[PDB]
Design an enzyme around this catalytic site. Structure first.
Site, PDB file in Angstrom:
ATOM      1  CG  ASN A  37      71.541  24.689 -37.410  1.00  0.00           C
ATOM      2  OD1 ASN A  37      71.295  23.788 -37.806  1.00  0.00           O
ATOM      3  ND2 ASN A  37      71.124  26.012 -37.464  1.00  0.00           N
ATOM      4  CE  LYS A  93      73.393  27.749 -39.796  1.00  0.00           C
ATOM      5  NZ  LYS A  93      74.062  29.214 -39.993  1.00  0.00           N
ATOM      6  CG  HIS A 143      68.637  29.642 -38.115  1.00  0.00           C
ATOM      7  ND1 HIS A 143      68.914  29.984 -39.185  1.00  0.00           N
ATOM      8  CD2 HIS A 143      69.670  29.192 -37.187  1.00  0.00           C
ATOM      9  CE1 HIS A 143      70.300  30.296 -38.923  1.00  0.00           C
ATOM     10  NE2 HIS A 143      70.533  29.466 -37.577  1.00  0.00           N
ATOM     11  CD  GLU A 160      70.923  29.854 -42.004  1.00  0.00           C
ATOM     12  OE1 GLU A 160      70.537  28.723 -42.059  1.00  0.00           O
ATOM     13  OE2 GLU A 160      71.804  30.287 -41.583  1.00  0.00           O
ATOM     14  CD  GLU A 207      72.317  31.670 -34.200  1.00  0.00           C
ATOM     15  OE1 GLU A 207      71.558  31.417 -35.291  1.00  0.00           O
ATOM     16  OE2 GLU A 207      73.212  30.988 -34.189  1.00  0.00           O
ATOM     17  N   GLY A 247      77.686  33.075 -39.785  1.00  0.00           N
ATOM     18  CA  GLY A 247      78.605  32.509 -40.913  1.00  0.00           C
ATOM     19  C   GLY A 247      79.602  33.447 -41.601  1.00  0.00           C
ATOM     20  CB  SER A 290      81.232  33.817 -36.222  1.00  0.00           C
ATOM     21  OG  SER A 290      80.750  34.178 -37.416  1.00  0.00           O
TER      22      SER A 290
HETATM   23  O1  LIG Z   1      72.457  27.836 -36.387  1.00  0.00           O
HETATM   24  C1  LIG Z   1      73.359  28.600 -35.878  1.00  0.00           C
HETATM   25  N1  LIG Z   1      74.037  29.266 -36.367  1.00  0.00           N
HETATM   26  O2  LIG Z   1      73.431  29.845 -37.582  1.00  0.00           O
HETATM   27  C2  LIG Z   1      75.582  29.792 -36.360  1.00  0.00           C
HETATM   28  C3  LIG Z   1      75.902  29.679 -37.740  1.00  0.00           C
HETATM   29  P1  LIG Z   1      77.609  29.930 -37.604  1.00  0.00           P
HETATM   30  O3  LIG Z   1      78.293  29.249 -36.329  1.00  0.00           O
HETATM   31  O4  LIG Z   1      78.317  29.045 -38.937  1.00  0.00           O
HETATM   32  O5  LIG Z   1      78.160  31.516 -37.764  1.00  0.00           O
END
Ligand SMILES: O=CN(O)CCP(=O)(O)O
Ligand SMILES: O=CN(O)CCP(=O)(O)O
Lengths: 249, 249
Positions: free
Chosen positions: B10, B12, B94, B96, B166, B172, B212
């Protein structure tokens, strides 16, 4: 004299590759002989397709929305990403975003400010609802939306701003504002900018009307002195967009 | 035996054309010799670029978000528009989007239901916050999010669903969940699906861990019996994504 008019097509969340290829060819074959800036705003996934096919020199491409910075914002597109692919116009604060997706005056003013800092031309949308209009609050509402944006800008940033007045009751309903209704609001906005920002800024500012514009009512709206062009939704998905452009002559 | 694993990137709201062209070449030159479905989710404006350059046969492209129907939704991209350009995977719910952009359990469940009806493969995200975790509500939260989605689906639609757990505190932050923390939640989800939906559905369901993940902790997470792969944010923008894919062997 009026400033340079703008005819902007907001395709909202519509289109297929087949239907966009045909419409763009229609726009390409229409020769525009007067000074007007034409703007097309397709969905984000269609920007590349439109960039590859659109050849008419009077047009620029705009995004329909953006966020200010890249980062962990799943699903969004930022201003630096748009600039990197060649897009430097953006529509912000559309009524649909203010209504469904939580964009308040503060959020819209921050996005407009950031867009101006990053060198975009911005089409900032304002407008009252039917309830506000019947309560005689039109002036108060449109000036509150505008001054919230003005508070985050410097005088020089007004060169990149275009205002689009779209009464919420005229959006997609078929009930266009009359030339007289639209002209009174546009005049009120121009005077406010003239007094609060500067008379030089007010003389050059483009203020567009949007909400059920079509090829038959466009010429009558454009005849008013403070109307500088249009933001068009449903009629911009059809070949009559050509005659909307030609109504700004 | 485990079902087929998934390694999903992803991106983002990140990327430039230059940086995406380089990373995609890195993915193309990495030969994958085991059965895994790789997924890349770029911003909407980069879908066409990624479609044109990505050649590795183990990969599919996914959108990071969508709305169910085309129409007057300035700024959004719908499911029919994605299907028309060849995209038939989507990430929904997600954290976010749930946090910043107002997607409640009901909104996410309606989007997932519509995506399944339109033939998408969906990666549906769930997870608790640090506050819920410390209040010993992890199980209640993740099962409430999941049953809200389950309520809008038919048994056959589970074939198109992938769950991604997650924890919000691992996204993050660099604080990955331990293999034991993740395994306990994945096991709880699988059992709930087995009891409420069907044992045949539970046996085939992919449940991914995200938050992470990096190339060094991936192999230890994948060793747990109910972890079927990963949703990766920050590490998916780097060449070490190759070793995350290879940790699902
Ligand atoms: O969409 C996937 N995620 O938000 C994982 C984010 P991350 O791998 O930077 O902690
Ligand atoms: O963005 C532009 N507008 O929303 C005008 C919408 P319409 O022309 O369909 O009434």
């Amino acid at each position: 004299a009026k400033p340079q008019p703008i005819a902007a097509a907001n395709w909202k969340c519509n289109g297929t590759t087949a239907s966009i290829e045909k419409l763009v060819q229609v726009f390409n074959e229409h020769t525009i002989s007067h000074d007007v800036q034409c703007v097309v705003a397709p969905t984000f996934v269609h920007i590349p397709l439109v960039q590859a096919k659109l050849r008419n020199p009077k047009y620029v491409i705009s995004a329909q929305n953006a966020i200010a910075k890249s980062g962990a914002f799943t699903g969004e597109v930022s201003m630096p990403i748009l600039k990197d692919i060649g897009v430097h116009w953006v529509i912000l604060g559309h009524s649909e975003r203010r209504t469904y997706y939580g964009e308040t005056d503060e959020i819209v003013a921050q996005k407009v400010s950031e867009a101006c800092k990053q060198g975009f031309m911005v089409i900032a949308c304002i407008g009252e609802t039917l309830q506000q209009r019947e309560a005689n609050q039109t002036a108060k509402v449109v000036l509150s939306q505008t001054s919230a944006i003005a508070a985050k800008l410097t005088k020089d940033a007004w060169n990149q701003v275009v205002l689009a007045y779209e009464p919420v009751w005229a959006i997609g309903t078929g009930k266009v504002a009359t030339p007289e209704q639209a002209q009174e609001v546009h005049l009120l906005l121009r005077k406010w900018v003239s007094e609060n920002i500067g008379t030089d800024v007010a003389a050059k500012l483009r203020i567009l009307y949007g909400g059920s514009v079509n090829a038959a009512n466009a010429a009558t709206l454009y005849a008013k002195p403070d109307i500088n062009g249009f933001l068009v939704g449903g009629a911009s998905l059809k070949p009559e967009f050509r005659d909307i452009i030609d109504a700004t002559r």
